[PDB]
């Protein structure tokens, strides 16, 4: 611990120093603060080179003719795809829609998203006009690194002499085209000296403050630390808006290689800025010699709905509140057919949220697939891949993925009816090889687990995939007609899209469950919620008001940890009248730090709360009124269960899992000795079955893949 180079008195810097974890990060915080304190970090005045008195906004005549013609000198486009996460099959579908042999594709995958990177590598190895960035940054939301990514990729693309591109377009894995490639090329060939950037469209002083442009930030330890105030440089006009844009090669060359006062000082200023790509390119362009080429239109449709998108949901990543646009739904299709202004792309789309709208758009642009094409209403998304290691899972998911595989092996044994040797009996081996989410018609169907096991009849290793689906537990007790439509317990509630991102509702003893209710239209009402643990202990009780306009409600009761393992129940009443109920599972864990749990560990984790009570308030008075007697025998058995390990613990776990999950089917990836097991590639549900909408083949005569 070395003292700083200057006295540090700013409250914001002190807070950051107290919260930072690495000493390298604390040192960089102190250096940045001290250099700014001496006035040596930020520029204070900048030269403006634009001859205009203000903005240009050169309009574009949006007639039907401007898009239908055939150009003699068509532009060639360089697409930069900035992607992260698990949605590789949707990214392949979108890549299919935008591909043409005359364009170029340069793909940056977040350094954290290793699964997606391996899938992207397969694409780049197939096509000569597709490349991946060798460098990979941890492009956190709102981070300064997103501008560093764009600027490095621009320098890279300019040095690739074998790629003669005319325009630069950036896209995410949640973007999609809303016009054909032919119409895009025709439009850009007509306006090839223009730049397309969209401004905020409001009070400019309010934009600066809302964006935090007058505050100093530092990106370190995958976090944006706020370090204090700063002045907007004098002599230039500051503007901003959307960081999705289209820029021509001439302007990208200026941004990259110019050494004049404007470009130099702006690259320094924006190295310490939040959401830098949302104002850097606006500010440079409007003050540069190229200011007369700006079109106040980014040719995008962004589905902003700040009533749902502004929840200050990134506080753990950045020292600021942010907003995000919503995902499109089927009712939004008509918005893509507007011709008030020219637009060629839209965002956001998410296949795990709603795939129907994606299909409607793709078929509308490029037509239906042939009759009999499989998998068009399905979606598969990988959530664990063996090369990433079991330490990238948690003790919870590792425990439950193991249990799901055993549930499949028991189904294989049961499905064969014979009086001789059972050629469908298996012994599990190793850890799961992969796990997929499975959707059909925008409805979650469960998990697909790929795993290895020994067929005991022939004593040979086989690779299988199991499909497990959760049992339906929501029950309406009303006989009479109220507003309640659904009730659910989970974690990682997404306030913008109104769903749990823990799709399987997988829970362990140290998790903090969230209760959600879904309501229909109607007058105000007040209801009672009750949480019941596996041995009929009442953990919490509270009342909630449902306003006439409320659509969803949720609450996370403060329950002391650890939770008693078993099947919990959540009940809703209306003045003591039953309304509805639902159940959820707190699973006992078989692993500790990815190793088999030990007796003292298990006893500590599976014997209920440490303080011997879920809350300070007690609800023993309600047990008789609700007919919830506590059986002294079941309590003692729960204590015996808490001390179990190994085989006894595995039987307890699988018994609970089997009561809340169903092994729907199991298939073999290769040859098998089980006579009743289908080959995975021949099923309709396996991740090995055909999925042509996301498969990439040879380039067609017209230069397309779709």
């Amino acid at each position: 611990d070395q003292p700083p180079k200057c006295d540090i008195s700013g409250k914001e810097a002190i807070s950051a120093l107290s919260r930072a974890k690495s000493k390298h990060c604390r040192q960089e915080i102190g250096e940045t603060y001290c250099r700014h304190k001496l006035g040596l970090l930020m520029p204070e005045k900048v030269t403006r080179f634009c001859p205009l008195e203000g903005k240009a906004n050169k309009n574009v005549q949006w007639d039907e003719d401007s898009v239908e013609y055939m150009p003699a000198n068509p532009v060639r486009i360089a697409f930069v795809l900035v992607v992260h996460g698990r949605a590789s099959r949707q990214l392949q579908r979108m890549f299919k829609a935008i591909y043409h042999k005359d364009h170029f594709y340069y793909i940056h995958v977040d350094k954290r998203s290793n699964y997606l990177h391996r899938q992207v590598l397969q694409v780049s190895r197939q096509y000569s006009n597709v490349r991946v960035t060798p460098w990979r940054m941890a492009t956190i939301w709102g981070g300064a690194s997103l501008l560093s990514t764009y600027l490095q990729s621009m320098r890279d693309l300019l040095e690739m002499t074998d790629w003669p591109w005319d325009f630069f377009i950036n896209l995410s894995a949640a973007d999609y085209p809303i016009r054909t490639n032919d119409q895009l090329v025709a439009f850009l060939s007509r306006y090839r000296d223009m730049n397309f950037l969209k401004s905020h469209g409001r009070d400019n002083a309010r934009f600066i403050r809302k964006q935090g442009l007058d505050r100093l930030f530092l990106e370190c330890d995958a976090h944006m630390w706020r370090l204090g105030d700063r002045r907007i440089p004098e002599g230039i006009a500051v503007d901003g808006g959307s960081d999705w844009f289209l820029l021509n090669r001439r302007f990208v060359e200026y941004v990259t290689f110019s050494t004049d006062d404007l470009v130099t000082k702006m690259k320094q200023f924006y190295s310490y800025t939040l959401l830098p790509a949302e104002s850097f390119f606006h500010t440079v362009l409007e003050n540069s010699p190229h200011c007369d080429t700006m079109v106040d239109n980014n040719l995008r449709i962004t589905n902003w709905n700040r009533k749902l998108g502004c929840k200050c949901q990134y506080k753990h990543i950045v020292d600021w509140c942010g907003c995000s646009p919503n995902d499109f739904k089927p009712q939004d299709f008509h918005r893509f057919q507007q011709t008030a202004r020219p637009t060629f792309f839209a965002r956001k789309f998410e296949a795990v949220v709603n795939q129907e709208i994606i299909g409607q758009l793709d078929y509308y642009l490029y037509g239906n697939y042939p009759a009999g094409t499989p998998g068009l209403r399905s979606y598969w998304e990988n959530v664990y891949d063996e090369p990433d290691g079991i330490h990238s899972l948690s003790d919870v998911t590792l425990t439950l993925y193991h249990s799901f595989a055993r549930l499949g092996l028991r189904r294989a044994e049961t499905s064969l009816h014979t009086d001789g040797e059972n050629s469908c009996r298996y012994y599990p081996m190793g850890h799961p090889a992969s796990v997929h989410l499975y959707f059909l018609a925008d409805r979650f169907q469960g998990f697909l687990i790929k795993h290895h096991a020994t067929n005991l009849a022939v004593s040979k290793l086989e690779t299988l995939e199991t499909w497990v689906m959760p049992k339906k537990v929501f029950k309406i007790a009303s006989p009479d007609f109220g507003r309640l439509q659904f009730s659910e317990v989970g974690t990682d509630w997404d306030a913008k899209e109104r769903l749990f991102r823990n799709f399987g509702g997988l829970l362990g003893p140290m998790d903090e469950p969230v209760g959600m209710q879904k309501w229909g239209k109607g007058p105000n009402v007040t209801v009672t919620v009750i949480w019941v643990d596996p041995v009929n202990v009442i953990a919490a009780t509270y009342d909630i008001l449902i306003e006439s306009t409320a659509e969803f409600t949720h609450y996370k009761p403060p329950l002391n940890l650890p939770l008693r393992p078993g099947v919990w129940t959540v009940k809703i009443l209306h003045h003591w009248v039953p309304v509805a109920e639902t159940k959820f599972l707190v699973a006992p864990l078989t692993f500790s730090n990815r190793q088999p749990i030990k007796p003292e560990e298990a006893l500590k984790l599976h014997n209920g709360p440490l303080r011997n009570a879920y809350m300070e308030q007690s609800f023993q008075s309600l047990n008789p009124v609700l007919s919830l007697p506590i059986n002294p025998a079941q309590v003692e058995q729960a204590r015996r269960n808490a001390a179990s390990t190994g085989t006894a613990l595995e039987g307890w776990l699988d018994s609970l899992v089997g009561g809340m999950w169903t092994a729907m089917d199991i298939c073999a990836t290769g040859p098998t000795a089980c006579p009743v097991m289908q080959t995975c590639s021949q099923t309709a549900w396996s991740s090995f079955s055909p999925d042509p909408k996301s498969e990439l083949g040879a380039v067609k005569p017209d230069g397309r893949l779709r």
Binding site: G142, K198, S199, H200, G201, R202, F207, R209, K210, Q211, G212, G240, G241, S242, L274, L275, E278, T302, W304, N305, R306, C310, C312, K315, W320, C321, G322, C323, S324
Partner: peptide, 10 residues
């Protein structure tokens, strides 16, 4: 709606 993802200090 308008553009710009910044939502203020909080």
């Amino acid at each position: 709606e308008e553009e710009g993802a910044g939502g203020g200090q909080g």
